[PDB]
Each structure stands twice: as structure tokens, then as C-alpha cells.
Symmetry: D2
Subunit: 196 residues, 4 copies
């Protein structure tokens, strides 16, 4: 059984960068739905698997990836943000960024370009490539999780689904990206990085 | 050269079903961007084609489909709505619907299910299948146009991208679908149907 | 657990339309591989599912659909062929065909066109639309199974992967299609149809 | 206008690694088809573009990518092979390889794994990442060209469509991969690399 994780702060904690209304809808409505739908889908899949019903297993793939991915992506997202975030990262994460992207500002531009360039709904990802041993930026459509579809280990995710910024920034996705840098929890990104 | 078409009514004409703010953003910002980006992309494609640069032609495919599709989809959408719409269609369109879906209410359920079931951004379409000679419902991802990708002739389109309802209905997509039936321009759908 | 099904005839029973070498490789090598990889994939999915590992489940989807689909498609294919097949169908099936495609000739023309037009590897399908209650033609890429991805019930499948004809007909897919009509088991197709 | 390129050697020059029959069919039949269909598709796209027909342009995308990609991929492939090829690369290329993949052996191991793992028809590519300045391995489905869809610059391509080996190696793709290393034109690969 999967559960909706509690937010590490108060819905209004990210203001004025991300207003309380968005945080509340995004977490208590959108994320909750994914978790609920995921549990329903997993139960159906278990039955199909027990019966060896391959057709049913393949028919359920879209619902599982969408809801399972929705749950995974958001759980990481909440930990990537903090009312005490912002600024730049330090330690070896910082040097990894300089080494792989040239500079922190260059990295920001790269991830911002990837995020803003998503057609429709999606996510912009900084991830870690275990095979090559370096940082890598990637964009994923809809709710397709980073690791499950690309193999990259997620470090920092940026949700560019409209439900993440439209109420406040409307059609100006770049304004949203500009504001989010102020609440990035770099200690969390560093932990995730040191883990892999 | 492609142009942003004028709306056949006043931004506030669809209230209280679709508020003026959404209509204004959707038309003057979102649709305008698609048209502008389409013209820029078409010009690049013409140059690539003149030079026989196949790589450049393939690299531009996503931008052309997204913006070209955005322009096509919305141009039809505006004509599908009307402050004097609502109710049910009459004439042979109505009997085609009864014949292919059983009843008008059944048709509404079918198209509503298709529209609400879109994962991420997309469109719900009632179209005409010229090969088989009957009505057909289809859902398209993001801005993928109906005819260009499926061959079906579009009759009525329902935009389920968040920029079409979120400001007003938030995460409750079903409430939006419920309201839109009140402003469907059936005379336009009938014209499109009689044309094919 | 899934098993490679035994054939209702010997490998050379369909000559000269489809030679023995192709039948032997297709069944003992290609289908066998799918069955083996499918068993391994379900095994892993069972472990991932028991541990609630959503990432692992999503990572396994491509393999499950490809090998699971391979097993489903070929299992049906073998029954669709017969050393004493060929000719035309009779009864309700022949009636449904004339009604949905005009005539047996047009149906054949349509299925052939759908099969030859597949870009790369895939399958051409005559299917049954349970929702609309009519016959329908569809093409699927690689091993994507008909019912699992489109909802249509499979009645007759034409494998257009190179391993189904290349040794005998080389690049001339049209010659392959022309020949296969001589070994279609209409009795089995009729059976599948009546079950709808 | 696009033309079928003449080969720098005769069809049987690569034996016994790749037999003459395969080379003849692959070049005079498969590549020829792509070139012919590509010319027809560009012709139609030019008409659609002049009339501002966005629907037609989008409908033509699948054909342009498939045949255009087919032409691009095979044109490069022929230059990647040589009757006096084989062995290992030298100079900067060999340096870059060891640096990005540990050693020539690991690189070979990686490219082989990527090529054999392709589900259905496709290509395994050694490419150059102009943005990151390092070598990269990638696999592409059907005829999707490397640069047009991933941005990577192609250096070496391995065609894993059945029409490239089936007549000789049947279902044993690994045997095909093992053999092709004996006819790789490292001189041409080095040339493409130095051009970056
Ligand atoms: Mn979200
Ligand atoms: Mn819209
Ligand atoms: Mn097969
Ligand atoms: Mn080839």
C-alpha cells in the first residue's frame, strides 16, 4: 500500500514564490488522486498477474505508469523544496555542477530551458547517470518517472504541469521557473547526490 | 502566412460557463503564441526544404506539429462554441448520433469519458470517418490535430488542456465538461458534418 | 507460467505458400524466445509488486509488452493458419465482412494494404469492435497486442515481421500477402467471431 | 532531389562477414526504395507548404521521417564499412573511446549490447555529443535518424533491421554483430569524429 506523504512544511511556507492555494491543490487533491488511483491499479494488476492474464497486464500499463509516476515524481518534488532553500549548493555537488555544466548559472539556464521547452505537461529533471558517473538534465512527458523510463537517478525535479503554476503565473512559465530557484532545498539535492 | 482569427463573440459571452479571463488568455495569449511560432517554424522548414536538408526537416517536426496543431485545433474550437449554443442538435446530424451512439445522452457520456480520460494535456474529438461513413470519438494528446494524425474529419472539439478550465474549475475536469455542453454551437457542428 | 504451444500441423504443412524453414524458425526460435522472456519478466514484476517498487514495475513495462505481446500474437497466428485453409469464409462472418467492407474482395484489399503499409516490424489485424458491434481493421507496431492496446478483439492476424517471410519472399512483402490467403483458417476465424 | 549513392566497393567485397546477396538487396532494393519514397514525400510537402496546408504537412511527417531517415542512415552506413576495415581505431578517436568507455573492448561491448537489445527494427549508434563534448551510445527505432531526433552527431552506425543480416545469420543477431567488427571503416569514423 502506498500513502500520501505529509508535506515537510505549511502550505503557505513557500510564499510569495508559490502561493498557498497552489500548494494545497497540488498536494491534497492532485497528489492524493495519484496515490489513490495507484493503489486501485496495483490491486487490479496483482489479480491479472495471478491469473497470468497478459492482456489485462498490458491494458493497465498506462494507468500504472501515469499514477505510479505521479506518486513518485511528487514525493520527490516536496522534498526538493523548502522555505529555507534558495541560493546555491556547496560541497562536491557544486563542483560536480561546475565540472559537468561549466558553472551554476549555466546549469540553471540548461535546466530552465529543458523545463520551459516541455510541450504540454511534463517535468524537467537534473539526474545522475550511474553508468557514466556525471550529472545530466532530462525532460519527461506527463508523469513518466525519471528513473523508471531513463535509468537516471533523480536529484532535483521541476514540475511544469499547469497545476503547478498557472493559478499564479498564468501562461508565463518562465516567471514560475525564475521564482522556484528561491525555494530549492539544496541540502536535499545534496543528500540524494551523495547517496548515488 | 497564418493569422490569429478573431473570436466570433465577446470574451465574456460564454459566462458563466467559461469566464472571460479564460477566454481572453486562451485566445489572445495561448492561440496567438501558436500562430506566431507556427509562422516562424514554417519559414525555417521552407529553407531546410530548399536545401534538401533532411536532418533539419526531421528536427523541426515536433515544433511544427505542436504549433501547427495548436493553431488548427483552436481555430475550430472557437467556431464550435457560441453564447447562443447549448441544447441538442437537430436534422440528420441528430439521427447520425442516434444511429452511431444510440442516443444523444449516450453520445455525451462517450465524448465526456474520452475527454476526462486524457492523461495530461489533450483534446476530445467527435469526428467523421469518411472511409466507414459514420461518426467516431477520439482523444488526441497535446496539440496533435485530429485529421492530420488520424484522418478523421473534425466536427466538435473539447480542449481539456488546463489553460482551458483550471482558473475556474480547478482540478474538477468533470465540472468543466458539464458546463461546456451549454455553449456548444450545434449549427456549426452541423455545417461541418454536412460538408463531409 | 506460460508455455510454447505445440503446432496443430508440421512445419512443412503450409508449403509452398510459407516454407518449412520459416515455420520452424518462427515457432521454435522466435516464439520460444518470447515465451521464455515473458516468464522471466512476470517473475520480476511479481517481486517488484510485492515490494511496492513502482520504479521497477514501470521499468519492466517495455519488456512485458514486447514479449507478452509476442506470445499472444503468435499463439493466435498459429491457429489462424491451416494446411487445408484458404478460400472464403461463410455464414455470419462472410455477412459481417460484406456489410462492413462492401465485399470479401475489398476486405482483402484493405487488410493487405494495412499490412504492407506497416513501417518496420508489426502486424495487420482484422478485429471486432465490441463497443460498436462491427468489424475493424488495425495495424500494430512491433509486438504490441491488439486487444491490450486498442481494445479490439482479434479475429485474424497477419505477421509482417521480416522473420515471417524474408527468407522466402525477400523484400517483396506483397508476394507474401498474396500467398498467405491460401492458408488462412477461416474456420478458426469464424470461431473467434462467434465468440463475440 | 535525392539520389541513391554508388557504393565504394562491389557487393561481394565484405564477404564472408556480410554476404553479397544481403549487400545487393540492402543497397539496390531497400535503400533505393527509401530514396524514391523520400523524393515523392518532399514533393508533396513542398505543395502543402506553398498552400499553407498544415494538416497535409503533419500527415506527411511519418513518411518523411521514415524514408528520409532511411536515406540518411544507409548513406552513412555504406561509408562506415570497408573491405579493408576492421582492427581498432587510432589517434584521438581511440583516446576519446578509452576516456569515455574505459577501453575499446568495453566500448565494443556497450555498442553490441545496445544494438542487440533493440526491440524490433532499428539502429545502434556511436555518436558525438557536441554540447557535452563526449562520445555517446544511442539506439534508434526503425529509421529514426540519430541527429534529427537526438541531436547527437553520428560517427558509426550498426543496422539491426532483419534485412541487414537475417539471410545469413537468421535469428542470431549476436553472430551478426561479432562479424561486422571485421569490416568497420575506422578511417571514415575517425574522419567524422575529427569534423566535430
Ligand atoms: Mn504536479
Ligand atoms: Mn487550448
Ligand atoms: Mn512473428
Ligand atoms: Mn537497412
Amino acid at each position: 500500500k502506498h500513502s500520501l506523504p505529509d508535506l515537510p512544511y505549511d502550505y503557505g511556507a513557500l510564499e510569495p514564490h508559490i502561493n498557498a492555494q497552489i500548494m494545497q491543490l497540488h498536494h491534497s487533491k492532485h497528489h492524493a488522486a495519484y496515490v489513490n488511483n495507484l493503489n486501485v491499479t496495483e490491486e487490479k494488476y496483482q489479480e491479472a498477474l495471478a491469473k497470468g492474464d497478459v492482456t489485462a497486464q498490458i491494458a493497465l500499463q498506462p494507468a500504472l505508469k501515469f499514477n505510479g509516476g505521479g506518486h513518485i515524481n511528487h514525493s520527490i518534488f516536496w522534498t526538493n523544496l523548502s522555505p529555507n532553500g534558495g541560493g546555491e549548493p556547496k560541497g562536491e555537488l557544486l563542483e560536480a555542477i561546475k565540472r559537468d555544466f561549466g558553472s551554476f548559472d549555466k546549469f540553471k539556464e540548461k535546466l530552465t530551458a529543458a523545463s520551459v521547452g516541455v510541450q504540454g505537461s511534463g517535468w524537467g529533471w537534473l539526474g545522475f547517470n550511474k553508468e557514466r558517473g556525471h550529472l545530466q538534465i532530462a525532460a519527461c512527458p506527463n508523469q513518466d518517472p525519471l528513473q523508471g523510463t531513463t535509468g537516471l537517478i533523480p536529484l532535483l525535479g521541476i514540475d511544469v504541469w499547469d497545476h503547478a503554476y498557472y493559478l499564479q503565473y498564468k501562461n508565463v512559465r518562465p516567471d514560475y521557473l525564475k521564482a522556484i530557484w528561491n525555494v530549492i532545498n539544496w541540502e536535499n539535492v545534496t543528500e540524494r547526490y551523495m547517496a548515488c
